Task: structure prediction
Amino acid sequence: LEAQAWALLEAVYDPELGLDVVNLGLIYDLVVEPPRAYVRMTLTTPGCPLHDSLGEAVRQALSRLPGVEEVEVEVTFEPPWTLARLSEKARRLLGW
Amino acid sequence: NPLEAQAWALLEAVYDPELGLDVVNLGLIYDLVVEPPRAYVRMTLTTPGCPLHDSLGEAVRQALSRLPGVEEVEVEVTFEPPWTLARLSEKARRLLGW
Amino acid sequence: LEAQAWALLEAVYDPELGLDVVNLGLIYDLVVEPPRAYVRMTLTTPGCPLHDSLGEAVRQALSRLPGVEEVEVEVTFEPPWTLARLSEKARRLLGW
Amino acid sequence: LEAQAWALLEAVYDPELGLDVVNLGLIYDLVVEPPRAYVRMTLTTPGCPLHDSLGEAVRQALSRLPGVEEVEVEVTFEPPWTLARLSEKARRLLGW
Result:
């Protein structure tokens, strides 16, 4: 369930950097407890966008989990994100 | 060996129901100081917010009370810094498939 | 584009520690989308200096990328910086 | 002399955890430029102690660098410290 949720989030890509939210280090917490799924995440820029497409795409991915009918996506800026949260793979891909 | 190492091993028995891993590998323990007859630990929870019953904090208090010469355990539950999965141990990641 | 930007920033040195901003861990966010370039960074000490030379040098460095006329340099203290953010190569040069 | 600095501090020990403030990850910033010596550090517990020995002790070890007569020790709680800031050595010593 938690492994499946992680694999599903790896499909959610942040267009600005061209990497998935997981390798970008944007997912802060993930809990799956049918019929609910809970994910706490952040964005690379500290401000709420007019449309949280990324949060929406994360909601859609988790919904496709077995036994999940309720998906809660909490977008927070605590702690504030920095490039340090990238995975090594993400770094190699950005040339950082 | 030292009371510190023992405390660590004891806290590894304290499991967070939600994720199915111990509080130490989950990175929920921020500070641990053992000075008989006292034991102090500052920890956090995976989600921001005080639960109606802090079962996890209570289990932590229980585990530390087993330490030799410890009769009073203080468990401070803070949200600073705010916890994230990045605090998981490499081992914790493996088990979760993350 | 992200890789060239990163490399260009490695040229910006911080007088105080004699190391570049990248190895010092001062760059929190980097996004290149011509004609714009965006960088969120911090300083080693809390507080805005009378003249943010470091911020200015970052502006120039990015003001050289292909198709970039508007560079935004946001200097934040969130999260607050510490020496733990230095790269392995940085602490290697500082004997830390 | 950013090594004279790093060394003198590694001699300052925290009685509570029996380790040096450096390996404990308590030193956030270090800047020495005679006659000035500046260090930003934190404590393991949240709150100012009646007597900040570590702070005092840090000032003393820094008041003996090359030509340093004015040492500044800023004790902050930002970012808030946690055991995750211990060095690998501190860990393989406190059995953590």
